[PDB]
RNA sequence: GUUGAGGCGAAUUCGGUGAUCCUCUGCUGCCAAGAAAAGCCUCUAGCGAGCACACACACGGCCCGUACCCCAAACCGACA
RNA sequence: GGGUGGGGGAGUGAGAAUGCAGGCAUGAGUAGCGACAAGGCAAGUGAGAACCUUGCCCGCCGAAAGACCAAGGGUUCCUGGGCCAGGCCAGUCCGCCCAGGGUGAGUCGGGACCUAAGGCGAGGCCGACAGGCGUAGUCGAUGGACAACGGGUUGAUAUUCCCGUACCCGUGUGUGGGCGAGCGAAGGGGUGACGCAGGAAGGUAGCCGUACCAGUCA
RNA sequence: GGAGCUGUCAACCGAGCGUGGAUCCGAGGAUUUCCGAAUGGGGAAACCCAGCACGAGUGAUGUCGUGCUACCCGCAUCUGAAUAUAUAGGGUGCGGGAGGGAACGCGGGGAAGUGAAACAUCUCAGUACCCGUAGGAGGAGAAAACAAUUGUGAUUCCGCAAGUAGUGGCGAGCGAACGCGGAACAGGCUAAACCGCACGCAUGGGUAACCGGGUAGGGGUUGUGUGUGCGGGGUUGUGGGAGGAUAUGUCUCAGCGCUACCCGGCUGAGAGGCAGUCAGAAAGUGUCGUGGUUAGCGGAAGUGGCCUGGGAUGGUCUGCCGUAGACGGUGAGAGCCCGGUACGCGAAAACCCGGCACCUGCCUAGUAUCAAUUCCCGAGUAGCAGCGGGCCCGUGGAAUCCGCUGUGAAUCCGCCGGGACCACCCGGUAAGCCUAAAUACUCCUCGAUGACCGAUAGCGGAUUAGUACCGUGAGGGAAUGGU
């Protein structure tokens, strides 16, 4: 997964560049990992995959 | 908005075989294609005040056509070949 | 028939004038099949006048023009 | 008998042979081990004060195809 | 619709591009006229006949060159007309042209029943997007289930129309007596339900004779 | 509108209609099979099969008519599995979406042939194409801007600047900006600080408060802090409010914050003023226009003589109109024959436009100064590091801008930019949103035009034309005008 279901961050698109300066398409994929999110505390938990970034804030429970 | 019979039922259909039919008391009619053999006995029953036995239809294409624009078709049909009761009081169709 | 000359016809002789109107339509529709109608204008005068009465059965449910 | 259409209309028994067909979705052999679902039957869950059954009568049976060509002059090959 | 002159502007000039389009030559009245079954006579029709019609001879196929179905085609079917195109000739004929007509189902082949492979696929999972896959489900016969036979009739349809005789599903109304059982279709279970090869036995169709019947006297 | 008409290939007829106003033209409505996003279910598009409800029909099954019945999303309600809180899910009711469209827009993905006389960087070209997604336009837009010592002041678009500065296997090529001249101009709304109201959470009973401020008593625990909702308030870069003090002031009335007094606050209503269909808030009903669009109507002046001719619209004498000598038709070059033209009228209704009302919203309490003790300015953001993209910049000392990864701030005595960076100085206030006009385009509707074509041309298409025909299909695709 590519897309964060909080802040719909998706993966960027650009060049590897060698030595040569020979460009070919590459992506950047956001760091996507799967949280399993409860909405309050005890609830029943549900699987999201989300960024890092909203890891790390506190967009998300457990 | 009230649908009656008289619209399903088109025309007579006039031919040699629909005379040798009339002989015997078998009407051909042109019936609305999609109508099917049951509104058909209906309709005969109630148009002509009569006990239709048996109603047998056959759809029959429209006849294609060279003309100087091109092919045309001609309208697709739907006979209805009633028979009725052994007995019961012909239709007049007038002709 | 006339669209003014239809509205003093109520609400049941309408339908009941558009059903001899169906019944004439019939009988005129076997008269050209078996050709012995001489003037085949009526069935095109018959079938507008069926139109005519639809229209008017279908503005006074609509709300236009009722009355006996 | 426009040689159309009619009307009448005999005998039809016993054998032989004999299937690619039936008994046979059987039997036997084999290994490579040979659809599904509906349908039908049955069970109960359930429904149930009315039922089943017989016979007689009277009815309803829908839609689509149906012409014609098919080792072809009408299908596939530009062609009878 | 033009001419001339002062100017202005060009899709302004063709003989070639194995150039493009159309018309028409040359080859040439030449090759060919599509199987090696095979035609003939008489009569007819007709303006016109090798080819059409009728009759009769002769020949050819006959595990098809016969009769059917499916797919495919689409009116080519029948009748009546037509004959300058088409048919490898001609054509009076025709699958050609024109008009009219013609295809009748409770049981046939399909659907309204069932599912196979496979397809689509609520939600769903996955995937930047596009989208991929797929559950429930729903389609999908080439298979499963399911009730009609014989004869006649039209120019053209017939297991469809008609006759005779059936069978299947459903509906209503009566009568009789019986039971106050009866219906159970969610689901369960059984069946459905299955390969290949090989006979044998009992049979039947068909076929060949035959009792008998009816016609013929070359 | 006013006498013919029953469209056209396309003649023949047949049968009729029309001054009791047809045909015809404009507008509104009615009907509107089946397919198609296609949406009851299914399907080989235009077919098949339903369920429910209400009717019609039958003796009853058959049968007919009309509605509703896809999925998803949002909102609102009911229920709340495993499992308790609950949620997932499910029921119901309202709304909405889906698909199409010639071009123009925005965001995203993104070639190659080609050029470099090879070729990979580079080019082609962010083109073709694709994905998403609009709108009548769009995007951008209100300074974390430029500039450089006086400055300009949102954006867009046009012309320059300039083929310049630059950038480039410094090759092929690529290529700004500052600023100047124009078109058009327009600015606004959002948190907190802080303040009331309601809900939930924590704490205490004379600890304390609290009951609008002051004055006294009374009540004798519903205060205080906090999270969540509703409002106010504020929205700025000369930085932008409170919280206090000091003066000054409250349009009227009724009710309220325990009571009595002064002051004051809150609500409501009236009154007054302001604005409005808008970006800045949003809908509805009447009335009226010298209004406009969708039909149309009137509209001058030669039967002129002779000639040629089948025909005069030609020639040649003459007569006229002209706000009309545009154009076309009419038997050959017609201002005066016809349709018209100049010009002048014209609209039931519908739509558009505008006005007046009605209506809706805002204001009627603040102001000024002092002082700077306190708080406020939008975060996984900026910055920094890595890897990329994009700018003239092809990573270079790489500034500005964008993406992903990691790390990760501060709220003005902050933060960002001014081409590494530092100091100073200057400029500006990012991480929220909205915003007209000038700009782009023409499937389509009118009105014109052409030193454009004139049937091998001009559209592929003057003609059955996206037809015939060809192809399984995507696709390809003609020819044919003139008595
Ligand atoms: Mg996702
Ligand atoms: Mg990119
Ligand atoms: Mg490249
Ligand atoms: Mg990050
Ligand atoms: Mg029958
Ligand atoms: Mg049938
Ligand atoms: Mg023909
Ligand atoms: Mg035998
Ligand atoms: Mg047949
Ligand atoms: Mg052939
Ligand atoms: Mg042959
Ligand atoms: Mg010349
Ligand atoms: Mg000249
Ligand atoms: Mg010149
Ligand atoms: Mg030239
Ligand atoms: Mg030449
Ligand atoms: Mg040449
Ligand atoms: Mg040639
Ligand atoms: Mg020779
Ligand atoms: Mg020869
Ligand atoms: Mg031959
Ligand atoms: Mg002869
Ligand atoms: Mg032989
Ligand atoms: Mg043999
Ligand atoms: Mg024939
Ligand atoms: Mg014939
Ligand atoms: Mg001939
Ligand atoms: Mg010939
Ligand atoms: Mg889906
Ligand atoms: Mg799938
Ligand atoms: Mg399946
Ligand atoms: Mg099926
Ligand atoms: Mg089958
Ligand atoms: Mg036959
Ligand atoms: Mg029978
Ligand atoms: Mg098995
Ligand atoms: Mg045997
Ligand atoms: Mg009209
Ligand atoms: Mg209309
Ligand atoms: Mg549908
Ligand atoms: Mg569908
Ligand atoms: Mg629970
Ligand atoms: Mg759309
Ligand atoms: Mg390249
Ligand atoms: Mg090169
Ligand atoms: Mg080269
Ligand atoms: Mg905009
Ligand atoms: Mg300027
Ligand atoms: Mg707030
Ligand atoms: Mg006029
Ligand atoms: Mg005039
Ligand atoms: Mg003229
Ligand atoms: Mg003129
Ligand atoms: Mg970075
Ligand atoms: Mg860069
Ligand atoms: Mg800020
Ligand atoms: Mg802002
Ligand atoms: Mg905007
Ligand atoms: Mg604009
Ligand atoms: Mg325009
Ligand atoms: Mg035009
Ligand atoms: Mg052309
Ligand atoms: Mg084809
Ligand atoms: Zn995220």
């Given at each position: ?5 909080i802040?719909?961050?998706?993966p960027?698109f650009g ?15 956001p760091n996507?990992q799967?949280?399993h999110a409860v ?6 938990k549900?699987?999201?995959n989300?960024?890092?970034?909203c890891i790390?804030?506190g967009?998300?429970?457990? | 908005?009230?649908?009656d019979?008289?619209?399903?039922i088109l025309?007579?259909?006039?031919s040699?075989?629909?005379?040798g039919?009339?002989?015997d008391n078998?009407?051909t009619?042109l ?10 006995k ?7 005040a ?9 759809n ?5 056509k ?6 045309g078709?001609?309208?697709?049909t739907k ?10 009081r ?6 | ?6 509205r ?11 059903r001899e109107?169906?019944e004439?339509?019939f ?9 012995q109608?001489?003037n085949?204008r ?5 079938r507008?006048?069926?139109a ?15 009355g006996?």
């Open positions: 997964a590519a897309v964060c279901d802040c719909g961050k998706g960027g060049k590897s560049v060698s030595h040569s300066h020979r460009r070919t398409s590459r992506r950047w994929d996507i799967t949280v909405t309050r505390p005890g609830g029943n549900k699987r999201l989300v960024c890092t970034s790390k804030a967009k998300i429970t457990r | 908005t009230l649908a019979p008289r619209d399903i025309a007579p259909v006039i040699e075989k629909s005379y039919l009339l002989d078998v009407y009619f019936v609305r294609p999609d109508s099917n053999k049951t509104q058909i209906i309709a005969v029953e109630k148009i002509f009569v006990k239709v036995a048996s109603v047998n239809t056959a029959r294409q429209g006849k294609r060279r003309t100087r624009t091109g092919y078709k001609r309208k697709s006979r209805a070949i009633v028979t009725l009761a052994p007995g019961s012909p239709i007049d169709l007038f002709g | 028939v006339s669209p003014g000359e239809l003093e016809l109520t609400d049941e002789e309408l339908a009941e004038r558009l109107s169906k004439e339509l009988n005129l529709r076997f008269q050209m099949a078996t050709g109608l001489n085949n009526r069935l095109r005068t018959v507008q006048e069926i005519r009465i639809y229209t008017v059965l279908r503005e006074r449910e609509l709300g236009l023009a009722t006996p």
